[PDB]
Amino acid sequence: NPCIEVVPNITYQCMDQKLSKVPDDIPSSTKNIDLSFNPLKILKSYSFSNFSELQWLDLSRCEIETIEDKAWHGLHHLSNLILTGNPIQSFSPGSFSGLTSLENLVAVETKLASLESFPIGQLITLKKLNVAHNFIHSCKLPAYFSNLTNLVHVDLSYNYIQTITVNDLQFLRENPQVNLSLDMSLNPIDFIQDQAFQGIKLHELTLRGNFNSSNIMKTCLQNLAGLHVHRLILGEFKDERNLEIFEPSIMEGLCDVTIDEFRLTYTNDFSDDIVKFHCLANVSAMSLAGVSIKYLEDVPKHFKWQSLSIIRCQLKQFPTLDLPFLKSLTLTMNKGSISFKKVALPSLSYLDLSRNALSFSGCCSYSDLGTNSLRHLDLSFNGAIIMSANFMGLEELQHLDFQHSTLKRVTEFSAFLSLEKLLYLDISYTNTKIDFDGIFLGLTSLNTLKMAGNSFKDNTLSNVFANTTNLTFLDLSKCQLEQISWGVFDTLHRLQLLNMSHNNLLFLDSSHYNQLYSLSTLDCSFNRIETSKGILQHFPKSLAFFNLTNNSVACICEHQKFLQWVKEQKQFLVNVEQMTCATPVEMNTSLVLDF
Amino acid sequence: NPCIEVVPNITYQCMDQKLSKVPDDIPSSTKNIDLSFNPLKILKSYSFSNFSELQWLDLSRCEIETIEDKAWHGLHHLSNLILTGNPIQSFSPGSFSGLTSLENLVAVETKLASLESFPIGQLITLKKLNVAHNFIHSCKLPAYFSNLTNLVHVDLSYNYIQTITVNDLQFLRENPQVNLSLDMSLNPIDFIQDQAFQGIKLHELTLRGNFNSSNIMKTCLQNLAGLHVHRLILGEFKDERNLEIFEPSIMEGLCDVTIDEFRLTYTNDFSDDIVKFHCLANVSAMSLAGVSIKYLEDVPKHFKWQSLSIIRCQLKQFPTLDLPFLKSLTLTMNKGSISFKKVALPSLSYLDLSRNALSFSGCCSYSDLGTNSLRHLDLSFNGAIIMSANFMGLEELQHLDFQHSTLKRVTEFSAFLSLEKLLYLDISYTNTKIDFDGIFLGLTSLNTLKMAGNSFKDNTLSNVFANTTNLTFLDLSKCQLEQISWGVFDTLHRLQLLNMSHNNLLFLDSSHYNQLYSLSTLDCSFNRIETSKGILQHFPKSLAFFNLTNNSVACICEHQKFLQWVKEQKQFLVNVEQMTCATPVEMNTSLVLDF
Amino acid sequence: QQWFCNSSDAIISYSYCDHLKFPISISSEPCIRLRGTNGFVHVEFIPRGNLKYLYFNLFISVNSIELPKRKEVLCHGHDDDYSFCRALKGETVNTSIPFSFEGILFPKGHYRCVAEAIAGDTEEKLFCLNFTIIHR
Amino acid sequence: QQWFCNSSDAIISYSYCDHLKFPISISSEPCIRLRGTNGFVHVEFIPRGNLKYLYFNLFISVNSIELPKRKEVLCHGHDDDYSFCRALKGETVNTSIPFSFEGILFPKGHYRCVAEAIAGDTEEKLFCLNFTIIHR
């Protein structure tokens, strides 16, 4: 009742009203209610019996100290339950009884003491299970995990875990076919009982911020063996006390684990020597993000790397590389200004060098990379890219992208002259005074073109799009065009959109638009049209949308044929009830037109 | 008569008319006539007696085979005479008799055979003397050079000179106080007689394209000794056959000559080892231009260099340098793209790094150069210059210059905050949306400011020039200003020019311009003013110029006070007879104004 | 009017906003100086938001002259740097952060800046504060 | 119609202009090809100008479509590179120049370009020529 409804019987959002009881005035058949910071010192029975389709309930910081025997009596569809902050000294048997289809649980900050006295029992479906910030001391996995045929994540972070024993993970030895990711971050581990991990497989391990001294880490990392994993997360956080010296021999005892993707994170002490340590010879997907590298010099050839990724790492030089097996290199959001240098990578099929102030002088030919079979290129938000040769060795490509980058010398010759297989292109907001015809020459297949900010010669569209048949999405917006030459759009048989707005154009014609067979949407707005001039019948039939808002229409006893054709087909236009007319009589939404 | 006069009795330019005689119809008291390619098989006597002030005569490719006894009879002021191309088998005594004040001679391509039978004799004044492309075989300097008390250049290039002997230059041994530059370029020298040069001093030597083999050059360069020079020019030309291997030991025997400015030029074979060869330890002004260098690594500290200059040389890196005596470094028009790197030069007072695509990231503080006492800085026509710190160690400067260079992050803080001694500034054509006031803050002395292409916030001038008293030349042109706020130009006591044109401004006011005491010129053109609005009397008295062309003036029976004030003071305006007015009656230069 | 530290060349203070009142506890050590300093900053509060996509808006005024507005992303939300940027509603948050800068030339005037913390997708102001700096 | 060389993938020819007739003798060795070539080019003529500030103007037409115009400085006029750029009026000039380039992708069409030599300060056309290229 006193809370703030947003949508009819939906999102009642009854948060932070000084309450002491579930409200009864709430209309039944609601969808998502929300309570929070409301004092409910005790919770009682049957209170939710009325609601029958509530499928998102929240309870957070609602001071709770006990639950009655049956408080979730009738709830058929509740695919959420948050319980954060609620201090429950200890749970009671038979709880959670009524629920039937639950796909989440969040018991965080609950004053929980162990995992064995947790009366989950039989909850046939439970996708996740989140735990953290609790008073747990053990790590044993109880047996009732046998029934929950679907549980694809567990978290035990920020706990008081001290050791690991061979007794734990036993259920894993018994069950070889259980998918379960894991995390034990921020755990003051100082001992691992020998031969703990044996014939075991996971899907994600994670250890960040645990260790304090070097020898301890040496011993622990040594104690592992026989393990089988899919993603390591090693590193530390910049807001605790951590290591003082990183030695490439600290990660000894690692030449025994099977790994498929190593992943490092921010470290205080670092050295170029850490990488290409001989226990990293079979890591099949390298990765590193946030690491304060500075240089990347020669690397042995007897490595098996299928991927590399550098993200947000300082790099004051374009490093040289030679690896006859690497592919899918990625370097983005760099914190410095660099300049391209030739490399050699005989088998690469992905590249992304974006949002770096990268200047590429002798541009885009074979010799800069020495490869074939490239598929995705992206140099966007970079700086000046002097064009020196049209793409000559890279005769196979699929995407291409400049977004905010001054592209120089585009018009002195016909670039893009050899990309016979392309399916996308983007030259937008790159200051480009198009004064040479035949610029978009030679590229047949192109199903997208975005030329938002681009000037023209003496402000006129001039026979640019020729020999560009397959081209469905076109875009010429935001650019000053004071007229249109005769003969554009001659052959665009398949063009299903044409954005043209925010440019000064006193009148428009109907001699154009005459050959577009299948044009669905046609925006022409913010461009102060006075009236048509064509036959007003020669449009294409397969036409469904228009847009004529913010136009200055001559409203003084003239061209009444148009003035009535507008007043007949108000179905295809939009906001037909909102047009005004610009007369010697101003400040009046006069749409009478008595003629 | 039949030739094409240009200026009244001046520059008759009678070239390439099929003539056979000096024309007589030419009006006397002419200044500069010109004959060329006219067939004059013989030249005769007294022909120039009439002309009495002709002071620039040319004769080139006029086929001549002989001269009469006295053909220059009367010529009082002829400070030129060209004679190129005229084949004279041999000169005759007593020629050149009539002339009295000649300051040039060009006998080039003349079939001359020697320098001893040249009847110059007594020509009291002769500034230059050019010779080339002749049949000369010797090198002896005859004695009659004693009388010509002024001759500051000789040239003997492209000749058939073979050796040098101790007998030549004897006149130099006799005369220790004769200024004479020299040149013997393109001379197939293959022997120098021993002890040729002894107790001799010149002002320029020049040898380019002579040598053919290495040992010959070794021996010749060795034979020099005791010499005293002021400028060496060594190198070769890219259109002959020349050396194959350059050894730093070829320039042996050079540790004996005294030198004050070494100057090298283009060479086919080059090595970084050529420089800092131990026989270049006392060259007091290094220089090199056109040399295909690539790197410049460490250089010994026991060098005495006062200057360095690299021009048009490829350089794929900013070289490091450390020389406690070098000053006035210059690097311009580089053929590549580089990036600044810190250096150390404890005493430098000039720098010029212009027309190179140079990116200067951590910009312009002390640590980048490590010096004081800088005087002239110039980074113009370069690329993006991210500003990172206002100039902090360079508290003494005189000029500063950006011309076409995207200057980033200028507005996030008040740059130029510590240049308390400046006298010039140039921020033009650098896209800069001035939206922060107090940008030109902290710099008191500034007697020039050029802000040609610069946008504004919502197109209005807004209280920018404050605490900028001493400022005589100002400039706000070519930038779109749709109005002017009230209060600009409050304190510009000394401002003697104000360019404001090529911007859209419907009317102007007289409330401004009210405090400029000494404003001489005031352009306001191409900005479609309709009329003033002020009292039309409140202008400054010390005002001498205006400019009102290309303005749309309301010409329909209104604001006639202005329409008559324009028609009264037609002295201060310009082209007052050229104004029209924009009325319902168009296409008429109606300046009647009957009121 | 809660907290304020006195340094050699700085006077700093903050106070709650006028259209939002959610409590926070923040301070730093030691009282910073307007040149190179090294130290820490303590933080303790209760989220009221997911804090996964957290950033700021700063509106700055240098001696009565406005500047443009500043927006600095603090927790990208994917493999972040800090520990406190993984929290949940109603879960106590308590941490300490190290910092160190150098210093530039600063004019001598009355500064001001208003700082507001914004969530990522449920766009709402988690808190607002008035920061008042005097450089002297 | 004076000189023309036949190469494997090029047909080149030139002829005098229509409003200027001053003789020049020029040719190159060997008949260039539209990819990487190395060779020489011979020049002999009589200046009629100081040739100290010499440059070109090139008006180019790629298969009936115009381009912008090209201007390339050839002799700056101060410590230059070549030898022939120190000459005087009526003084015979004779030289040979080496060159070498690589090649780009060129469309297959009828090119054209008009080339005019301009002096520096006494601006006047020293000569004019019609260059006709066929790429095939």
Ligand SMILES: *[C@@H]1O[C@H](CO)[C@@H](O)[C@H](O)[C@H]1NC(C)=O
């Ligand atoms: C195992 O569980 C993870 C949990 O996210 C899931 O991503 C992965 O696809 C699962 N593996 C298989 C084979 O389904």
Ligand SMILES: *[C@@H]1O[C@H](CO)[C@@H](O)[C@H](O)[C@H]1NC(C)=O
């Ligand atoms: C780290 O080790 C040091 C030295 O033994 C000890 O003083 C400190 O308490 C340890 N800290 C942690 C987080 O274990």
Ligand SMILES: *[C@@H]1O[C@H](CO)[C@@H](O)[C@H](O)[C@H]1NC(C)=O
């Ligand atoms: C057309 O482009 C404008 C440019 O801002 C955009 O706002 C509008 O949504 C577009 N209309 C379409 C794509 O129908």
Ligand SMILES: *[C@@H]1O[C@H](CO)[C@@H](O)[C@H](O)[C@H]1NC(C)=O
């Ligand atoms: C019509 O133009 C308006 C103006 O912005 C735009 O908001 C709207 O999306 C357009 N409608 C269509 C159907 O394109």
Ligand SMILES: *[C@@H]1O[C@H](CO)[C@@H](O)[C@H](O)[C@H]1NC(C)=O
């Ligand atoms: C010597 O002659 C040269 C010739 O140009 C001149 O530049 C130089 O100033 C003269 N030297 C003196 C001391 O006059």
Ligand SMILES: *[C@@H]1O[C@H](CO)[C@@H](O)[C@H](O)[C@H]1NC(C)=O
């Ligand atoms: C250079 O020396 C070679 C070999 O002795 C000789 O054949 C040639 O004529 C010489 N050329 C010149 C220009 O002296």
Ligand SMILES: *[C@@H]1O[C@H](CO)[C@@H](O)[C@H](O)[C@H]1NC(C)=O
């Ligand atoms: C004012 O500036 C314009 C800009 O092109 C220039 O043409 C004009 O000569 C200038 N007038 C002066 C400096 O008096």
Ligand SMILES: *[C@@H]1O[C@H](CO)[C@@H](O)[C@H](O)[C@H]1NC(C)=O
């Ligand atoms: C007046 O403006 C014209 C227009 O270009 C300019 O040519 C001329 O130099 C100006 N005259 C003065 C006195 O500034």
Ligand SMILES: *[C@@H]1O[C@H](CO)[C@@H](O)[C@H](O)[C@H]1NC(C)=O
């Ligand atoms: C926050 O952490 C600090 C770390 O020393 C601890 O001293 C403090 O007790 C914690 N917060 C509270 C409310 O105590």
Ligand SMILES: *[C@@H]1O[C@H](CO)[C@@H](O)[C@H](O)[C@H]1NC(C)=O
């Ligand atoms: C606090 O900030 C508001 C802006 O949100 C401002 O109007 C107010 O003046 C500030 N408080 C004081 C005491 O100035």
Ligand SMILES: *[C@@H]1O[C@H](CO)[C@@H](O)[C@H](O)[C@H]1NC(C)=O
């Ligand atoms: C031009 O120089 C060449 C170099 O071999 C020479 O053969 C030729 O004779 C010179 N010109 C003439 C007109 O001979």
Ligand SMILES: *[C@@H]1O[C@H](CO)[C@@H](O)[C@H](O)[C@H]1NC(C)=O
């Ligand atoms: C020679 O050039 C002119 C342009 O200067 C051109 O009009 C003419 O057609 C050209 N000659 C031929 C044969 O095309």
